[PDB]
Amino acid sequence: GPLGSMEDFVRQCFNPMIVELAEKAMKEYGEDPKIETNKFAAICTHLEVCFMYSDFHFIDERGESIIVESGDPNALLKHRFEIIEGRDRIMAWTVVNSICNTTGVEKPKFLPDLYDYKENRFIEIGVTRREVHIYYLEKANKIKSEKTHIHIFSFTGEEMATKADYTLDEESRARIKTRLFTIRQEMASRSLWDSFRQSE
Ligand SMILES: CN1C(=O)c2c(O)c(=O)ccn2N2[C@H]1CC[C@@]1(CC(F)F)CCc3ccccc3[C@@H]21
Numbered sequence: 401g402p403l404g405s406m407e408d409f410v411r412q413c414f415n416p417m418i419v420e421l422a423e424k425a426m427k428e429y430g431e432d433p434k435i436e437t438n439k440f441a442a443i444c445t446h447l448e449v450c451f452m453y454s455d456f457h458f459i460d461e462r463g464e465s466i467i468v469e470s471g472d473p474n475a476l477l478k479h480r481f482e483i484i485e486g487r488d489r490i491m492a493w494t495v496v497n498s499i500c501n502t503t504g505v506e507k508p509k510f511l512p513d514l515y516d517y518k519e520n521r522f523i524e525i526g527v528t529r530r531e532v533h534i535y536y537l538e539k540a541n542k543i544k545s546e547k548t549h550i551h552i553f554s555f556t557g558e559e560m561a562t563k564a565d566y567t568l569d570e571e572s573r574a575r576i577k578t579r580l581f582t583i584r585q586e587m588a589s590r591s592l593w594d595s596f597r598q599s600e
């Protein structure tokens with residue numbers, strides 16, 4: 401069919417909060433969302449994954465990790481994950497430093513994406529249009545002996561995580577994989593997927 405705009409796709413597919421945080425991040429790093437449109441889409445996707453990973457996961461009044469999908473958590477429930485991504489660098493490092501003071505976890509060399517209050521570890525989220533093992537190994541060769549746990553998602557449903565430790569249940573991860581599949585198929589419908597896949 402016709403070739404669409406990636407700009408139009410991003411503004412229709414992602415919630416306005418995600419699009420706004422992505423625009424803010426690209427301005428911070430000197431990237432124009434109007435030009436680097438495939439990168440804008442990749443930033444929105446990765447943000448959405450980070451939010452989806454955290455969504456519905458709480459620590460309850462007994463210190464137990466649970467799942468509440470109702471939308472209406474009582475105010476004794478703590479989010480299981482701190483979301484680091486989506487914050488300007490100052491606030492992102494302020495949150496990191498605050499977690500490290502609270503938990504005694506080592507301060508990470510590189511800004512991570514999430515912190516898991518159950519597993520007591522930072523998380524690096526990856527989303528790739530390439531083979532997941534290739535992107536896992538690129539992240540691994542960057543993080544080295546840093547204690548940040550790596551979790552990679554592809555658009556084809558493959559995953560790879562540090563030491564085969566996937567953190568979340570299968571249904572939580574399937575929600576993320578279903579969303580990535582939806583994004584890929586809607587990109588393909590608008591003849592965007594080929595440029596997007598090859599720009600990685
Ligand atoms: C600080 N950054 C990250 O936290 C990060 C990731 O967590 C990641 O998994 C992969 C790439 N990352 N990077 C870097 C640098 C800054 C960008 C965003 C900026 F252009 F607005 C560069 C492009 C880009 C594309 C997709 C997703 C995220 C990012 C960001």
Ligand SMILES: [Mn+2]
Nearest residue numbers: 485511512513
């Ligand atoms: Mn990040």
Ligand SMILES: [Mn+2]
Nearest residue numbers: 513524525526
């Ligand atoms: Mn990441």
